[PDB]
Design a protein around this ligand. Sequence first.
Ligand SMILES: CCCCCCCCCCC(CCCCCCCCCC)(CO[C@H]1O[C@@H](CO)[C@H](O[C@@H]2O[C@@H](CO)[C@H](O)[C@@H](O)[C@@H]2O)[C@@H](O)[C@@H]1O)CO[C@H]1O[C@@H](CO)[C@H](O[C@@H]2O[C@@H](CO)[C@H](O)[C@@H](O)[C@@H]2O)[C@@H](O)[C@H]1O
Lengths: 92, 179
Amino acid sequence: MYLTYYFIEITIFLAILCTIFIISAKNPMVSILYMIALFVIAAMYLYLIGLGIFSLLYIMIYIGAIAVLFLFIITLLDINSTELSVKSNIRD
Amino acid sequence: HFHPYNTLGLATQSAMVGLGAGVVAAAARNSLATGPRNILTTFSKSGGVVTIFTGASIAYVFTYCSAANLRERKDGWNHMWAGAATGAVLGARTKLVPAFIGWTVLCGAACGLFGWTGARFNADRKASLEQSPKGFVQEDAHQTFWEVVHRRPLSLTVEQLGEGRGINAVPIATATEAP
Ligand SMILES: CCCCCCCCCCC(CCCCCCCCCC)(CO[C@H]1O[C@@H](CO)[C@H](O[C@@H]2O[C@@H](CO)[C@H](O)[C@@H](O)[C@@H]2O)[C@@H](O)[C@@H]1O)CO[C@H]1O[C@@H](CO)[C@H](O[C@@H]2O[C@@H](CO)[C@H](O)[C@@H](O)[C@@H]2O)[C@@H](O)[C@H]1O
């Protein structure tokens, strides 16, 4: 019964974790896929708080239009990217 | 009247604050820069910023509190002496005597002009024209600051200006009267 208590805190931790894989990922579109995962974690939190309507509005609008737009850009365009080297961001 | 200051307490508070500002500005100098920089070049290629913040903080607040304590009043001169000490600390980084003298004199004059206008960036609420009594006095009263009158008391003129030059407690006419 009390296994269903910490869910909100779990999503918070899970959401935290997801952002570290967004800002540090070798391929770009893999990190945009982690952002899609972060929208899913948000919609989990919005069902979990009591707003079941919004969760499906997020999956419709953000995931299904904005992320599809982003992936569609990254496909047929040229973007250089450098890896998360320790030497360039240890100064940050 | 007034209350004396804790020079040691205010000085060590400012020393902690200047240490913190030095660390923040050193990190901002690393991260906004070029070339090969690591975690240990924070205090290596720092440009000596933490010495600037630390020395300026300690010198200004120590000279301000010491000058306010030996004069036993708080006015705009204490900011002049404290700003002169700040200019001495900032001017010793350029290891030249006429530079140093210029930094002291001009920083002390600028900080004294600051501290004479109230030593506040923002406004004072009760002292401004808009929140103070203005215009003529309605009846006879002590004319406060920002107020106009037609005639001033002559006793006030003798007390404020003096008993000397062309100025007297009795006009020169009725001092020379036939009876
Ligand atoms: C053109 C050449 C450049 C000249 C620059 C001007 C700056 C000159 C400032 C002078 C002036 C503004 C007048 C300027 C108007 C013309 C402005 C001209 C153009 C402006 C560009 C600011 O006077 C400041 O003087 C400072 C020291 O000198 C003080 O520093 C601070 O000290 C510590 C104290 O608490 C601080 O704790 C500390 O934080 C600071 O250290 C400040 O308190 C004060 O605000 C005077 O304002 C003040 O005067 C006093 C009189 O005594 C008046 O009190 C009146 O009189 C009494 C009963 O008779 C009664 O008390 C009262 O009933 C009555 O109200 C006030 O009404 C008030 O208004």
